[PDB]
Every structure is written in structure tokens, then in C-alpha cells.
Amino acid sequence: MSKGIVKWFNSDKGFGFITPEDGSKDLFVHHSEIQSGGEYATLADGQTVEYEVGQGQKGPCANKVVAV
């Protein structure tokens, strides 16, 4: 449901940081955590994606990354 804009995505590192649309603090996003039928999905700096915020011990994370 929720969706924001990726501050920067680096597949080489295997992770990136996203900037919440609502203005919330950046959330950790991993390449392997993406959820899409296609295997050619790519991400970069400013890439718009859809994600769910789920609290964690270190803090909330973003899962089910869908390219849009």
C-alpha cells in the first residue's frame, strides 16, 4: 500500500536506502527482498517503489519492493 522514493539503490552492495513519502526516517531495503514476477527489475537513485513498513528490533524496515 505505502510507497516512497529510493534515496539510492546499489545492487553491488546488495542494499539501499529509501526516503518515505510521508517524510518518515529512511528505511533499510535489500535487493533480495524485492517482490515482483519479473526478474529484470532494477533500482537506482530516485527509483519509485512500493513497500510495507514493519517494525524490528533495530527499527522498521521495508519489504515487498515493487518497481513503479
- Residues in Cβ contact with 49 at an 8 Å cutoff, skipping those fewer than 6 apart: 3, 4, 5, 6, 18, 29, 43, 65, 66, 67, 68
Of residues 13, 1, 7, the one with CA closest to residue 47:
7
Technique of determination: NMR
Which residue ranges form the domains of the chain, and what is each CATH number? 1-68 (2.40.50.140)
> Residues 13, 60, 66, 36: is their CA dihedral positive or negative?
positive
3-state secondary structure at position 55: coil
